[PDB]
Design an enzyme around this catalytic site. Sequence first.
Site, PDB file in Angstrom:
ATOM      1  N   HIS A 140       5.604  -3.799   1.120  1.00 32.99           N
ATOM      2  CA  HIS A 140       5.979  -5.178   0.891  1.00 32.99           C
ATOM      3  C   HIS A 140       6.149  -5.982   2.163  1.00 32.99           C
ATOM      4  O   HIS A 140       6.415  -5.439   3.238  1.00 32.99           O
ATOM      5  CB  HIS A 140       7.236  -5.255   0.029  1.00 32.99           C
ATOM      6  CG  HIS A 140       6.982  -4.897  -1.398  1.00 32.99           C
ATOM      7  ND1 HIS A 140       7.924  -4.293  -2.198  1.00 32.99           N
ATOM      8  CD2 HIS A 140       5.873  -5.043  -2.160  1.00 32.99           C
ATOM      9  CE1 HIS A 140       7.412  -4.096  -3.399  1.00 32.99           C
ATOM     10  NE2 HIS A 140       6.169  -4.547  -3.403  1.00 32.99           N
ATOM     11  N   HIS A 168      -1.170  -2.356  -2.769  1.00 34.12           N
ATOM     12  CA  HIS A 168      -0.518  -1.050  -2.824  1.00 34.12           C
ATOM     13  C   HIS A 168      -1.517   0.103  -2.921  1.00 34.12           C
ATOM     14  O   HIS A 168      -1.335   1.129  -2.274  1.00 34.12           O
ATOM     15  CB  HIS A 168       0.458  -0.963  -4.005  1.00 34.12           C
ATOM     16  CG  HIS A 168       1.720  -1.754  -3.843  1.00 34.12           C
ATOM     17  ND1 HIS A 168       2.445  -1.817  -2.668  1.00 34.12           N
ATOM     18  CD2 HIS A 168       2.405  -2.493  -4.746  1.00 34.12           C
ATOM     19  CE1 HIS A 168       3.516  -2.572  -2.858  1.00 34.12           C
ATOM     20  NE2 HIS A 168       3.523  -2.983  -4.114  1.00 34.12           N
ATOM     21  N   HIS A 172      -1.901  -8.009  -5.698  1.00 36.06           N
ATOM     22  CA  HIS A 172      -0.713  -7.304  -5.218  1.00 36.06           C
ATOM     23  C   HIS A 172      -0.867  -5.796  -5.373  1.00 36.06           C
ATOM     24  O   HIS A 172      -0.626  -5.013  -4.440  1.00 36.06           O
ATOM     25  CB  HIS A 172       0.509  -7.798  -5.998  1.00 36.06           C
ATOM     26  CG  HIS A 172       1.806  -7.190  -5.557  1.00 36.06           C
ATOM     27  ND1 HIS A 172       2.649  -7.807  -4.655  1.00 36.06           N
ATOM     28  CD2 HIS A 172       2.399  -6.017  -5.886  1.00 36.06           C
ATOM     29  CE1 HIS A 172       3.711  -7.043  -4.460  1.00 36.06           C
ATOM     30  NE2 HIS A 172       3.593  -5.965  -5.213  1.00 36.06           N
ATOM     31  N   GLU A 173      -1.281  -5.372  -6.561  1.00 34.50           N
ATOM     32  CA  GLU A 173      -1.371  -3.946  -6.837  1.00 34.50           C
ATOM     33  C   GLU A 173      -2.466  -3.243  -6.044  1.00 34.50           C
ATOM     34  O   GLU A 173      -2.251  -2.133  -5.554  1.00 34.50           O
ATOM     35  CB  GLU A 173      -1.519  -3.680  -8.340  1.00 34.50           C
ATOM     36  CG  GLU A 173      -0.269  -4.034  -9.155  1.00 34.50           C
ATOM     37  CD  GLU A 173       1.021  -3.404  -8.658  1.00 34.50           C
ATOM     38  OE1 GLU A 173       0.996  -2.365  -7.977  1.00 34.50           O
ATOM     39  OE2 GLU A 173       2.092  -3.971  -8.976  1.00 34.50           O
TER      40      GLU A 173
HETATM   41  C1  R4C Z   1       8.929 -10.536 -14.583  1.00 33.91           C
HETATM   42  C2  R4C Z   1       8.527 -10.693 -13.119  1.00 33.91           C
HETATM   43  N1  R4C Z   1       8.755  -9.445 -12.395  1.00 33.91           N
HETATM   44  C3  R4C Z   1       8.335  -9.250 -11.146  1.00 33.91           C
HETATM   45  O1  R4C Z   1       7.715 -10.089 -10.499  1.00 33.91           O
HETATM   46  C4  R4C Z   1       8.716  -7.918 -10.526  1.00 33.91           C
HETATM   47  C5  R4C Z   1      10.037  -8.070  -9.794  1.00 33.91           C
HETATM   48  N2  R4C Z   1       7.709  -7.389  -9.613  1.00 33.91           N
HETATM   49  C6  R4C Z   1       6.754  -6.534  -9.977  1.00 33.91           C
HETATM   50  O2  R4C Z   1       6.446  -6.282 -11.162  1.00 33.91           O
HETATM   51  C7  R4C Z   1       5.991  -5.910  -8.847  1.00 33.91           C
HETATM   52  C8  R4C Z   1       4.506  -6.100  -9.094  1.00 33.91           C
HETATM   53  C9  R4C Z   1       3.911  -7.411  -8.662  1.00 33.91           C
HETATM   54  C10 R4C Z   1       4.229  -8.307  -7.641  1.00 33.91           C
HETATM   55  C11 R4C Z   1       3.297  -9.357  -7.747  1.00 33.91           C
HETATM   56  C12 R4C Z   1       3.147 -10.557  -6.887  1.00 33.91           C
HETATM   57  C13 R4C Z   1       2.171 -11.497  -7.204  1.00 33.91           C
HETATM   58  C14 R4C Z   1       1.996 -12.626  -6.411  1.00 33.91           C
HETATM   59  C15 R4C Z   1       2.800 -12.791  -5.285  1.00 33.91           C
HETATM   60  C16 R4C Z   1       3.760 -11.842  -4.959  1.00 33.91           C
HETATM   61  C17 R4C Z   1       3.936 -10.718  -5.761  1.00 33.91           C
HETATM   62  N3  R4C Z   1       2.425  -9.100  -8.740  1.00 33.91           N
HETATM   63  O3  R4C Z   1       2.828  -7.950  -9.274  1.00 33.91           O
HETATM   64  C18 R4C Z   1       6.322  -4.440  -8.982  1.00 33.91           C
HETATM   65  P1  R4C Z   1       5.701  -3.359  -7.664  1.00 33.91           P
HETATM   66  O4  R4C Z   1       4.241  -3.021  -7.838  1.00 33.91           O
HETATM   67  O5  R4C Z   1       6.058  -3.899  -6.286  1.00 33.91           O
HETATM   68  C19 R4C Z   1       6.679  -1.927  -7.815  1.00 33.91           C
HETATM   69  C20 R4C Z   1       7.535  -1.576  -6.783  1.00 33.91           C
HETATM   70  C21 R4C Z   1       8.309  -0.435  -6.913  1.00 33.91           C
HETATM   71  C22 R4C Z   1       8.228   0.328  -8.073  1.00 33.91           C
HETATM   72 BR1  R4C Z   1       9.284   1.877  -8.208  1.00 33.91          BR
HETATM   73  C23 R4C Z   1       7.376  -0.027  -9.110  1.00 33.91           C
HETATM   74  C24 R4C Z   1       6.603  -1.165  -8.971  1.00 33.91           C
HETATM   75  C25 R4C Z   1       9.256 -11.877 -12.487  1.00 33.91           C
HETATM   76  N4  R4C Z   1      10.360 -11.595 -11.802  1.00 33.91           N
HETATM   77  O6  R4C Z   1       8.827 -13.022 -12.628  1.00 33.91           O
HETATM   78 ZN    ZN Z   2       4.809  -4.375  -4.906  1.00 32.86          ZN
END
Ligand code: R4C
Ligand code: ZN
Length: 152
Positions: free
Chosen positions: A118, A112, A108-109
Amino acid sequence: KHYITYRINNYTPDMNREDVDYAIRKAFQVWSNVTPLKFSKINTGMADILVVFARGAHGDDHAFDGKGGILAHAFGPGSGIGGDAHFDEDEFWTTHSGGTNLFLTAVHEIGHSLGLGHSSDPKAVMFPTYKYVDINTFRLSADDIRGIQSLY
Ligand SMILES: C[C@H](NC(=O)[C@H](C)NC(=O)[C@H](Cc1cc(-c2ccccc2)no1)CP(=O)(O)c1ccc(Br)cc1)C(N)=O
Ligand SMILES: [Zn+2]
Ligand SMILES: [Ca+2]
Ligand SMILES: [Ca+2]
Ligand SMILES: [Ca+2]
Ligand SMILES: [Zn+2]
């Protein structure tokens, strides 16, 4: 350009060092397999994409938030922190289902890091929310493929 370098700046103590190297290598491979991109690992010196583990405030005006919440973040291509992928050390990084899987998060990262935003496809690795999927059957969704091929 299609040649992009990376360096693993540091290693989470949650995992074996070798497992971090492997997870990161496989995450780059995922994207390399669907583009003309060539990735090259650097051990010392200048690299486009730095892989960093850090907690709380860590120098880039986007402080991490402790265990849970935001797991990681990354910056689109550029100088300095541009392209860099940061993983919140307050998470528990794993090769498995427990904690937060490093491989999946890294895919994912790196997405980015390469300039992706997204996806609206719930099966895409670029969907906004982390979900563990079986690593051995993992696949980029067709929307991820569209996204990355539009850039490279
Ligand atoms: C604890 C865990 N949290 C998450 O998944 C959260 C919502 N997602 C995040 O932490 C995003 C990071 C992430 C998404 C994924 C992923 C993996 C597999 C399938 C789909 C997605 N892997 O990491 C954060 P980001 O890098 O998008 C980001 C956006 C904006 C800002 Br400002 C900073 C960072 C959960 N909800 O299970
Ligand atoms: Zn993301
Ligand atoms: Ca960089
Ligand atoms: Ca967090
Ligand atoms: Ca940790
Ligand atoms: Zn950061």
